[PDB]
Structure 1
Amino acid sequence: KDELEDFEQGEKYLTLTVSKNDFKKMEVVGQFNLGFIIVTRKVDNKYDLFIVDQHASDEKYNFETLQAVTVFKSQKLIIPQPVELSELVVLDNLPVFEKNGFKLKISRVKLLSLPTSKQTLFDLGDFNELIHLIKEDLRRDNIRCSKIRSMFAMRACRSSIMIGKPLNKKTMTRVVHNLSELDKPWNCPHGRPTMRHLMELRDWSSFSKDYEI
């Protein structure tokens, strides 16, 4: 349990040391143990090495892409169902319901479509969960009910770069730079770290005999 402080200080360091732009300026050193991307970051006079998990970082990107763009498939209801709220202005302002497979007809709410999957059941408790999830929220357009969120987390995990997969500079570069598009992408959807600071390259007086007279 007490070992988790070393994990916390790593994510704490990242929030301060790494900005959205910092990722766009990172350079790929190479692949380490077929599972990590070693990167350099020199800005401004500061120079650091970071270690990136090829799977978790690729996954955090694919996941956040699914969360923002995907329109979930719905079941067109045979007889529409009404609902009472108060909270009524949250539904009558957001097309986050349409993205989550909730097609509506605008106190007086009308449910036209409910989301559907061949591996799970959807109900009104999921519609109300999404109604309360907006209350928490920050950007609200990428908000998803836990059932959908979990399915996207699996889609991302299955489609993302596997650990043990040899990668070329081009792919590794895209994986790291893609992180500049996300907000504080320190963890994958399952809570695993995407990256960590390795070391600062401050004072290394390397061999120079060849330029000395």
Structure 2
Amino acid sequence: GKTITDFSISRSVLAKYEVINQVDKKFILIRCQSIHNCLLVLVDQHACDERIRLEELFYSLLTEVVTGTFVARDLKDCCIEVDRTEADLFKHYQSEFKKWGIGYETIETSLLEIKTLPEMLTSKYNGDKDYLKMVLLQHAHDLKDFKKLPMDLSHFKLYWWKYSSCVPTVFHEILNSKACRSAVMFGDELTRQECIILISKLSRCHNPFECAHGRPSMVPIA
């Protein structure tokens, strides 16, 4: 069997590096024999820590969903007014929303009765029926418009990133904000040992080259 040569070059880059030290309390300076295309790289400490945290959160979320252990907290006094086309869309995707803890029933002018929600979404919603409708509609439309593929549980190691694309936008935004807020900031003091641990964890990431908001985590400076 054959593969594509360019896929392995990115992974091998970060494995051939060593930490020099923290720079301007914002970056981690790293250094790369066999330096044909690869020397000095400045890593944003915030972006780095945020990426480590994001993939831990994404692994926990998809492990819970794939194994059917994802918590679905019961919700009371939650009925949202929907159009006929909206009710049809929700009736069609009821089985798909159940996978993410979003449990509902379609009445009839029609009304969407939300029975259960994941803890993550219960927090974000905070009684706002308008927000919850908009958020559930966004996913239903994403599925309908082939922007999001449905969660296939026919397959069952758990490689979370193979199911990363199925994750609804609202869950993605929550996980990005949680990882961002938990991460080390600019101006924060890091010891050389702390920098070594961060770059070590980063090199084991599925996507070490960007932060939680699609911007680079590092820049070459040599």
Global fold match (TM > 0.5) = yes
| Contact preservation (8 Å) 2:50, 2:211 | yes
Stretch moving more, 149-158 or 181-190? 181-190
Shift of residue 52, structure 1, vs aligned partner: 0.2
How far apart are the structure 1 equivalents of 2:164 and 2:7? 26
| Contact preservation (8 Å) 2:48, 2:211 | yes
Partner of 2:46: 55
The aligned amino acid for 1:169 is: R
Match of 1:125 among 114, 137, 142: 137
Match of 2:185 among 153, 157, 162: 162
Unmatched 5+ residue regions in structure 1?
Answer: 1-14, 105-110, 200-213
Q: Secondary structure at the match of 2:124?
A: coil
How far apart are the structure 2 equivalents of 1:183 and 1:18? 14
How far apart are the structure 1 equivalents of 2:72 and 2:165? 18
Partner of 1:30: 21
Q: Secondary structure at the match of 2:31?
A: strand
Tell me the C-alpha RMSD between the 2 structures: 3.9
Q: How many positions carry a matched residue from both structures?
A: 173
> Higher Cα Rg: structure 1 or 2?
1
How far apart are the structure 2 equivalents of 1:130 and 1:27? 42
How far apart are the structure 2 equivalents of 1:55 and 1:144? 24
| Contact preservation (8 Å) 1:29, 1:40 | yes
| Contact preservation (8 Å) 1:67, 1:143 | no
| Contact preservation (8 Å) 1:114, 1:122 | no
The answer to which structure has the higher helix fraction is 2
Unmatched 5+ residue regions in structure 2?
Answer: 1-5, 65-69, 77-86, 105-113, 126-130, 152-160
Partner of 1:11: none
Q: Secondary structure at the match of 1:196?
A: strand
How far apart are the structure 1 equivalents of 2:181 and 2:55? 14
Partner of 1:74: 72
| Contact preservation (8 Å) 1:37, 1:53 | yes
Match of 2:205 among 162, 171, 182: 182
CA deviations 1:134-165 (Å, max 9, x no partner) are 42997115742111211111111111111111
CA deviations 1:161-183 (Å, max 9, x no partner) are 11111112222122222223333
How far apart are the structure 2 equivalents of 1:172 and 1:143? 33
Query: TM-score if structure 1 supplies the norm length?
Result: 0.62
Shift of residue 122, structure 1, vs aligned partner: 3.4
How far apart are the structure 2 equivalents of 1:97 and 1:38? 46
Percent identity of the aligned residues?
23
How far apart are the structure 1 equivalents of 2:194 and 2:116? 40
| Contact preservation (8 Å) 1:22, 1:180 | no
How far apart are the structure 2 equivalents of 1:52 and 1:185? 10
Partner of 1:194: 217
The aligned amino acid for 2:210 is: N
The aligned amino acid for 1:101 is: G
Q: Secondary structure at the match of 1:192?
A: coil
